[PDB]
Symmetry: C4
């Protein structure tokens, strides 16, 4: 109808309720489920759907062998109905590639897929299910993007891309798209020293992105975008409650403008909701691997370098595999505020479970409640032994 | 369009005709059918669909092992086209959880799923396919609901929940929802001593629920709700024709305000249509197990403590497995009266058929006819031996 | 929109072109295709679909064993997209039963399914996907109907039913339905001595049905219905070109008002287009079994007792299995005339191919062309050996 | 709405970006994917879909044995969602046959399928999903058509057919259809000596078709059609950069009005975009087999007999199997110009990979970019060994 405008602020997050879960790996043990990774969730005005990068093969299919690899010509961004598994028969291909983002601007959806060899990748921006714009690699080193939904405001949908090294300074750009066309792009500015895989959400005409500093930071870089002025700033979450993985143990004081040291060249896509006292951080429980998942209320995490948790909720037990996580909200829901939501990728297979030759995942997602709900843990649920 | 109003009375029930049957277990022996239990049927203004709690695995899948269990993080309320089986590819997830209810108010549908550990469960109320309200457990002991459709009147859709013991007094509540929001809730009142799994239907601005007294009663508790005044009453079906299972043999006089004794801490979800002489009771044929199913016309069953059958119809032979049963009607059909309908869950597998490691079911459903139709029996139809 | 009216006459049939073919048995050798029999085709104003009686199991499924049987509680009328196979995932159940008919009146569709034991069957008439009317068996001996589409005119859709013996006189009735309700029913009248499985089509406000005399006739009975006056007549196709199966060799003179003798208590559903010189008869090539299929132009077959073929077209080679056949037309096509169409059921499995324990079929269908097209033969295409 | 008119010229082609890829053979190793060949892509005003000739069996199905054959009664034109594989469950049959074409005129789609024995084939023209016209073979020798989309202008959709020898002069006809009806047909005229499988596109009220001279030419014949005057001309691409396969090595001067010699009675469906300096030719890399695929910018190829490449892009490595290729464009996209697109059929199985008994393919497709994008190669991706 009309372009959506971020007119509401976040609802108060007092707990998290179950939103969606597809049990993909369980079901896929005996049905035609596509092998995936890098999933997310994204809403249209009339429906919310699960998204992910397919590996172009079923889990039980012999071609599942080798899917630990990140970029092949057989991957594609696919979407499928909320809480269903990604099957050969119900998956809709949005575009071809090995890194993506997607978002609805209120009128129609924009989807972006990047494909190519490491030194010659390119992104193609689709809008209303048609290719509209293409961007060639600018640093010739794995052009890559969010791996979760972008956010739009009055037709303007900003997207964060990175091209260059994963273990040294790279060239991060913020592109402002409108109807699939480029209105403007900026180089990254601010104090964030490295950016990859931004998880974004919007509220009151501002877009907040919690990304990852793969090079040096165990605290997360944050990019705040003004989609009207089409400008932004960057910093790190000041809080001592470190949220990347792997990471060192939590200190008593964090860092606001530099990566918190202790772990280099590694990390996991993650997210946060930074809203003063209504601030919640997500993170793996393990400091060593993609294991477990919890939500911690850390009032003023973004700006308070000594902020520590005041409440929390366990999403996945430390004895269960987690993975990537990101933000999304249903901007077309009823009510006076936007309800914060997120998903956690539950990785199964390689490298942690090497008795099988594949790597895939299932999805679990939650949204906020103003109630103080009881908690449950939500594991993938599959028995690897069955696949042997 | 406009909210539906219960303006019609029931059609005269002279017999029951076949409405839907999915042969899920038969078909699922060689196709991707999800393992389920606790099914029901529910209509929208333009379509009627089968509903059930999936176990997050196919019947032939190795994860089918263990599905006798009631509550896991892998269950979800799903719906699928009338008379089709619940397949991985045609099942639509309504919400995540292990106890549910759902109903269309004329404009859109409300679905409720409860999930959690036994001492920390919570219900999330979805409306127009979005989460709107959440209710935390109040007795910290398996918050649970209907397992069949709720009914709406002018936007108000009452739902019965129980939290607390299954073998002693519990805390039953009646919530009146409108657009997924809570308008009001009452504690159970009346003479019903325990309530679980209410089967409801509406006619002439009144909602009748036939539930189950798991603690002491072999006769069924009945809750009648006024959705305008948002008030209710409770009692038991007075009739000597006992309809719970297991149960003692039928006496010559029943009980109107206390559970009829003989069997404790057990029972099965069931239903009835209480409409003076146009009264029909459903029940398993066996007094010991979920075996067989019959419909008995027991004029004035609700209020006459010596009422006995005047007509009847066999739905499932005592040599076939039955299970849960419940009411639903198509409130958007043509004509001057609402046609009473019900479904019977045909349980296969554990605990009765333990040569297989799974528990699932198929569905059979009937609706009333003003004709006096010939009867047939409708078994699940699957041969367990094939699954060995 | 508005009820359809049979305002056009038939197009001139100079040959038959390929319309649809689903290759169900071939494809079903390695995919989830339902076992069926008694198929047909029927159009809605915006789509034409394949219809059939499912057996409630896949072909490869173990429950396929025994599907040679005609009536079980596991059968249902299903429809699926033109030329696709009837799969577990794309089949839409219209109603439950073992004998059916269905037709669109221009506004919505009426579907009829009969279920029951032999001595207590009943038909339930569905309209706009809801049950509206029920009719109890009147002769207590396998109430049965067309097994192909009915035809409507200004809301009135006549249907032919038979109840009673298959090898002696029975009670045949013509019901005139409008919006699923009974307007009137007549007993069969005319000279037809036995009626079963009528194949009907309409043109210029008249409905012609070519049925089968299972008891004594090798020539086919024909019922012509006036859907306005709601009256009918009956006779046999006068032609010496006999079209039932099994049957005696063709004589040089047929019979107009009595069954042509030579074969008792047996036959196959078949059809014809009786339109003066524009007359075409379908029949199996073999006089002994459901083998082969051909179309023969027999000018004035209905009224000329010495009429013999003037043109012809082979549909299925005598070295291939055929089966039932029937008429349908797309009454919502463009143009000035209705294009005659028909389908042939290609039966595979039992009783002719007993190395497998199942019985199923695929469908081939043709429509007329005013051109004189080259002919091809259209077999089922499956290799039984593969199923062993 | 209104008939589409070719009002735009081509966008400038500076490179090719990835459009769609279904990885059919990979996925089909463990899911219900139909065996196909002769694929293409075609757009409707609201969706673009993959098309192909099914073989009426799955790849893993036993009936896949023998699918190297071209024409059987089990083939049909099917379409399915962009980038999905052609599965039993998501494939929509457009018509029955072994040679086809299809195109949307802006209001609705016309699809054409030819079926029959070699000496008695016939084409049936479907419009708005109904059969409208039939054309009988005129040379009684494999009536055949494009195997890719046709193009329409103001309701007029020209189609090229060939009937007669594959190794000598044949009877090629250009039919001008409007709403499935024949407006006019011409015999081929111009200097093209043999025509088969035309790949067409339209721009500025002109339709260009790049076909194949199976008899003598290694350069490609080109037919330019005026769909208003309903007239055409024919010649060959003058360029020395030869684009058929098999073929001799490239000379330094080509031929404008006669087949370039060196290879007889063989070839592959191919295409080109002839637009002055904005000219791009597609071809297999190997001169001996359907191996590899590249796009070469050959300014003025059509008219310059010494034109050689000025830019290029590799689509498939010479160490990977290719096959047929053709043109299509989304005539309903936004913007001021039509974006040239094409697909390459990636053939797997027989005759080149004879360890398996089947022949099938997957599809890869690209569209033009005005950017100068980095290139990647796009192979089928399946491991034949897995199928053994
Ligand atoms: C039914 O459901 C309800 C609703 O969920 C249940 O109630 C919930 O119970 C939760 C578990 O107790 C609780 O979650 C905790 O909240 C704590 C905050 O609350 C407390 O402190 C505040 C502030 O003073 C008080 O106001 C309040 O009253 C409480 O006393 C958090 O601090 C908890 O998180 C910390 O502990 C968990 C382990 O339990 C860690 O996994 C987590 O990371 C936190 O601890 C690490 O991080 C901090 C910060 O740096 C460190 O200081 C600390 O040492 C830990 O650090 C190590 O571990 C991390 C992670 O591995 C590592 O990286 C680091 O290096 C170190 O090695 C926790 O979030 C909910 O708030 C509470 N909800 C409600 C509404 O009450 C109820 O129990 C259920 N009922 C039943 C019967 O089960
Ligand atoms: C073609 O189709 C038609 C249509 O369906 C067929 O006709 C139907 O036939 C049915 C079977 O006969 C019939 O159903 C019965 O109706 C009885 C009521 O009618 C009779 O009594 C009235 C009242 O006086 C008369 O007016 C009327 O004319 C009849 O004479 C019911 O009483 C029957 O139910 C009882 O029996 C069945 C076993 O048959 C039990 O399963 C059932 O539970 C009922 O009996 C138990 O319960 C009562 C009540 O407490 C006890 O008193 C009794 O002892 C039984 O109790 C034991 O069993 C229960 C259950 O296991 C247990 O819990 C308890 O402790 C005890 O152990 C039955 O419902 C249809 O009405 C009739 N329909 C029509 C329209 O006519 C026709 O036959 C078919 N044709 C052919 C050729 O087959
Ligand atoms: C390319 O395609 C075109 C288009 O299809 C091909 O041309 C077609 O060729 C067809 C085959 O020749 C032809 O079909 C036949 O038409 C005959 C009628 O035409 C002839 O007679 C008329 C009338 O005098 C002439 O005007 C006309 O010029 C012709 O001469 C039919 O009579 C044929 O059917 C009979 O034969 C077939 C066997 O071929 C039987 O299966 C069929 O049942 C008919 O014969 C039985 O029935 C009659 C009637 O009672 C008996 O008299 C006769 O003895 C047979 O009876 C036995 O068999 C039956 C069935 O098993 C059994 O029940 C009974 O008891 C007996 O045992 C046939 O229909 C098309 O008309 C013709 N089409 C056109 C447009 O030309 C062309 O060939 C193809 N090109 C190539 C290269 O292949
Ligand atoms: C990142 O991505 C970018 C973007 O893709 C990459 O840059 C591209 O690189 C491509 C490969 O170099 C390049 O493609 C070539 O373009 C040549 C034309 O450009 C050159 O000449 C012009 C004209 O003078 C100059 O202006 C320009 O500056 C260049 O110097 C083509 O000529 C190339 O095609 C020919 O070679 C390939 C093999 O490489 C053949 O397969 C192809 O068929 C062509 O050669 C055959 O045909 C010609 C014509 O008859 C014959 O003369 C020749 O001998 C060959 O003939 C044999 O082979 C054929 C086929 O098998 C056979 O039939 C015949 O009989 C003979 O046996 C080629 O197309 C892109 O243009 C370029 N793009 C851009 C924007 O720059 C960049 O490299 C990537 N980065 C990294 C790090 O990888
Ligand atoms: C069910 O009853 C309510 C009246 O209680 C109907 O609601 C009125 O509907 C009309 C048209 O929408 C409005 O102008 C009135 O204000 C509505 N509501 C109330 C609460 O007064 C409703 O239309 C009835 N539903 C149907 C299907 O007739
Ligand atoms: C079929 O015939 C009936 C007339 O018998 C048409 O019905 C009339 O339709 C118009 C418009 O709906 C009404 O105003 C008349 O009262 C209708 N009915 C009768 C029974 O008089 C009907 O429209 C015709 N169908 C079509 C498609 O033309
Ligand atoms: C473009 C790409 O391949 N990105 C990688 C990502 C990346 O390698 C690291 O962030 C370092 O740069 O790591 C991971 C990962 O799980 O750590 C998955 C991503 N997979 C995909 N998006 N396909
Ligand atoms: C919430 C829950 O687990 N409810 C149980 C129900 C319950 O245990 C008894 O009524 C006693 O309270 O029993 C049964 C049952 O088949 O008897 C199934 C239900 N299964 C599910 N709804 N998942
Ligand atoms: C109602 C019923 O079972 N009808 C039978 C039909 C019938 O038995 C004979 O016509 C004699 O009456 O025969 C056949 C048949 O193939 O000959 C199939 C039908 N199958 C089904 N419609 N299910
Ligand atoms: C009508 C028909 O069978 N056409 C053939 C085509 C043809 O044989 C040659 O062009 C020579 O005439 O060859 C090929 C081919 O791959 O070379 C495939 C086509 N397959 C199909 N369209 N089914
Ligand atoms: Ca890091
Ligand atoms: Ca009880
Ligand atoms: Ca007969
Ligand atoms: Ca399978
Ligand atoms: Ca050639």
């Amino acid at each position: 109808r009309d372009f959506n405008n971020l007119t509401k602020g976040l609802c108060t997050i007092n707990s998290w309720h179950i939103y969606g879960k597809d049990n993909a790996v369980r079901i896929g043990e005996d049905s035609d489920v596509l092998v995936t990774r890098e999933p997310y969730v994204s809403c249209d005005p009339d429906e919310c759907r699960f998204y992910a990068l397919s590996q172009g093969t079923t889990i039980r299919g012999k071609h599942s062998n080798g899917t630990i690899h990140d970029r092949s010509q057989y991957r594609a961004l696919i979407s499928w109905p909320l809480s269903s598994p990604p099957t050969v028969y119900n998956s809709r291909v949005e575009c071809i590639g090995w890194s993506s983002t997607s978002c609805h601007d209120g009128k129609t959806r924009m989807s972006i897929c990047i494909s190519g060899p490491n030194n010659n990748a390119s992104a193609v921006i689709w809008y209303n299910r048609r290719p509209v714009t293409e961007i060639n690699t600018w640093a010739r080193n794995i052009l890559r993007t969010q791996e979760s939904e972008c956010v739009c405001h009055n037709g303007v949908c900003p997207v964060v891309f990175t091209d260059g090294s994963a273990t040294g300074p790279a060239e991060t750009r913020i592109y402002y798209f409108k109807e699939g066309k480029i209105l403007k792009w900026e180089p990254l500015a601010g104090t964030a020293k490295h950016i990859e895989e931004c998880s974004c959400y919007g509220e009151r005409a501002e877009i907040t992105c919690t990304c990852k500093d793969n090079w040096q930071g165990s605290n997360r870089p944050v990019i705040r975008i003004d989609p009207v002025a089409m400008t932004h700033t960057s910093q790190y979450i000041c809080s001592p409650v470190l949220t990347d993985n792997p990471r060192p143990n939590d200190p008593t004081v964090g860092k606001c403008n530099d990566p918190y040291p202790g772990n280099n060249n590694n990390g996991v896509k993650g997210f946060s909701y930074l809203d003063g006292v209504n601030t919640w951080l997500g993170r793996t429980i393990s400091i060593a691997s993609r294991s477990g998942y919890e939500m911690l209320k850390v009032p003023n995490a973004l700006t308070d370098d000594k902020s520590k948790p005041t409440q929390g909720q366990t999403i996945v037990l430390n004895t269960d595999w987690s993975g990537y996580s990101g933000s999304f909200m249903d901007y077309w829901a009823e009510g006076e505020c936007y309800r914060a939501c997120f998903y956690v990728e539950l990785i199964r297979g390689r490298p942690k479970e090497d008795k099988v030759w594949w790597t895939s995942n299932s999805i679990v997602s939650m949204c906020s409640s103003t109630e103080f709900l009881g908690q449950w843990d939500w594991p993938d649920g599959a028995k690897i032994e069955y696949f042997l």
